[PDB]
Design a protein around this ligand. Sequence first.
Ligand code: CA
Ligand code: CA
Lengths: 40, 40, 331, 331, 144
Amino acid sequence: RDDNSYMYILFVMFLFAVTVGSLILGYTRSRKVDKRSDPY
Amino acid sequence: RDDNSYMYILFVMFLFAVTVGSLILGYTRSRKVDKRSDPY
Amino acid sequence: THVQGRVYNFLERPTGWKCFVYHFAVFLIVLVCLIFSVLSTIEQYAALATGTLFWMEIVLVVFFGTEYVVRLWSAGCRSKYVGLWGRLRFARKPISIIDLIVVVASMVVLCVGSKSAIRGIRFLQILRMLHVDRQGGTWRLLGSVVFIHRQELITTLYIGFLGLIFSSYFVYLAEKDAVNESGRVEFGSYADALWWGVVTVTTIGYGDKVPQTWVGKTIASCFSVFAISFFALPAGILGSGFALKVQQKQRQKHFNRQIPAAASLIQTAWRCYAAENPLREHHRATIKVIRRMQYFVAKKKFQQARKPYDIEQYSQGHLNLMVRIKELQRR
Amino acid sequence: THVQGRVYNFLERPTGWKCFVYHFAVFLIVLVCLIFSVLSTIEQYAALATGTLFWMEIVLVVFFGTEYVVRLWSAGCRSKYVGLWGRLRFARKPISIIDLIVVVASMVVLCVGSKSAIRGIRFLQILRMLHVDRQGGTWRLLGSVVFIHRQELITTLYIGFLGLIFSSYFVYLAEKDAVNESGRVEFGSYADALWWGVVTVTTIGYGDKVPQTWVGKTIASCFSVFAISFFALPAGILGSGFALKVQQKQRQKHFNRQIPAAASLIQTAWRCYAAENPLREHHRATIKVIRRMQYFVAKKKFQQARKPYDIEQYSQGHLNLMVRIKELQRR
Amino acid sequence: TEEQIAEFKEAFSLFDKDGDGTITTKELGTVMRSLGQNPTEAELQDMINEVDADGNGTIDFPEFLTMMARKMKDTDSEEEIREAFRVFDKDGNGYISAAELRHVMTNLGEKLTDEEVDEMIREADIDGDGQVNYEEFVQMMTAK
Ligand SMILES: [Ca+2]
Ligand SMILES: [Ca+2]
């Protein structure tokens, strides 16, 4: 019986959106994007 | 019922042939085979 | 060019506190439009997914169909590709090949369903999770940690798959004709005994197939221990390999900070020596103030470029060794 | 000898882009001839394995029966064994003892079945996976990582097997007479309670045997945690041990590259000094060009023999220490 | 330096067998083979890859003069040869015996002749002992 079965798809996509929402914040808050300027 | 039961033996021997096909490429692309010439 | 060079920093490789709000509240639109798209297959919550979800999908493909063209037109601010013929190699970037497939295939599926139809929207609505994680900064880590550790991974997968191919054949020879407690035969074919091998070599243990004859339980015991070890190996291998690559990026990211603060000191100390020759006199009376003023700021920046290291207690092999050479050098 | 020394590099320890095509498209013949040999036990796909599979097996043993003799005749290009009496110690190499067993035993089984017969072809067709991975380069890694770590492996297997022998006896004393929910008794003997011990000590958890009395569940809990740790230990142990041995081969493999480029500089610098004495005059006018010419190539090779290290940022303990001695040495 | 900057250009274009300003890397594989070397084309293309700093392959001495104008005797190429002994050093001090130096001289890299390697360690073993020190050799290579 699927009584509260929306809760599981509410939960797992939430815990995936959290682990994505710290991966886009981890590149928004990045400092520079210079590809080849490090060893020069 | 074994309807698509060829797929499992198709899959597992494929994932074994991949892990063999990087072990023979790992010795074909090796550089030398001199047994005792290292510390001399 | 300034009307186009800023958009390339706003959509791709983005930065700034509002780029997070753009590229996350698009992802929190894909997520709700996926949860409502997949709460329709519950057969009891299927009433929630009405036709307004379909029109919220067609306005979504309307939004992405101009988003891709905005990112295509704003691609000419790059040294790697210019114009229109050069920009085709911008569309070799596999996140863009994924995105083009997403927008055009979802548009094509929405056209034929508007003149198994709704089922194709689920796959091309799952695929839109991947295209908002930009820069591919996650797969570049894994595809290099696996490549550094190719030897041990190939070794343990070869040994584990050899143990799985071998010892899940002896179980089938020991259990080819034996019935369950409920009247069926578990290990009917080799594929059943191999499903068992994969399942018991990764320590799942579902319980649909357990060997009943007492010969097969011994083989299951032996192969259980001696291949559970070799299949649990890559967790530890990649666990070392992931924590050793981020520490190899926090070396060069600090070394990229050290160089402009080791340039701003020498280029300013030469300026502080050049006080002899750069009414033209009182204009030179003021520059001796500023060439001594900013030199101390550069001096503070250089000492802030080496003293904060990062895991900052890594001087624990060379505690006295950095001083025991210098005091010898002063004599 | 040149008609035989090249075959020994073509079959054993092979190298070159066509040796991969030989030694892999033999393995991709064994693999198809195994998949078709083991899709015959499905009782519904058994019609595919006709007699042409048997004749494809007899031409396969025809191919291997001359392959072994080719590798035997091409063995005399070795300093370890020569002639015919010496070559017996070439057949002590256990990959060749495996291969001889494969070819002769499969030939013997094919002879008696041509004048449970087809069942023996499955084992001697699984065994031909092992003999195409040449050089034994995988088992030499594992047999040395286990030998380096013999102490910790013997320790944790002794503690885990002691916990398994002890605490899977208290469960049998707590569950000797108790029936299931379906009318049978699970822990009938000690062997049933030990099957349970191995199964629950490796975290499989099939679910055929769960202790029903509430005394046994407590013992199962205690022994579960306190022996799952000691049986999950060797994964981490061998995971460190495999990634530490390949890094101990990429030290000596770079040190084997450094030595001939640290020889090609000194042997050429002596040549560059020997310009005094090696018409005999204009022939010596040309050698001063070449002894200065190739010296710079050797100089480039020596700096390419030490600057590319390998995990190439390993100077992070001795950053300033390689320079802080030399600048002291110049004073 | 004023007396050598003229007649060196007669030997510079001497490999092309003409008067053109060409180092003649394609003809160097015939000139060195006539001298008695006969290398492969891979090592021949590697010669002007680092010898000619211009990059074409045949030059009117931008770097063919700079190859002559690199004495290989100052303190910029005197420690790099001193590191080549340090790859062979065991237990410090530059222990290298005449037997070990003959072992490494006739075996690895680009080998010398026996009439060369037999007398190479002669002036570096003037004491006659089992230690051909590197400092006694680079002092002989100080004029190299
Ligand atoms: Ca020319
Ligand atoms: Ca040039």
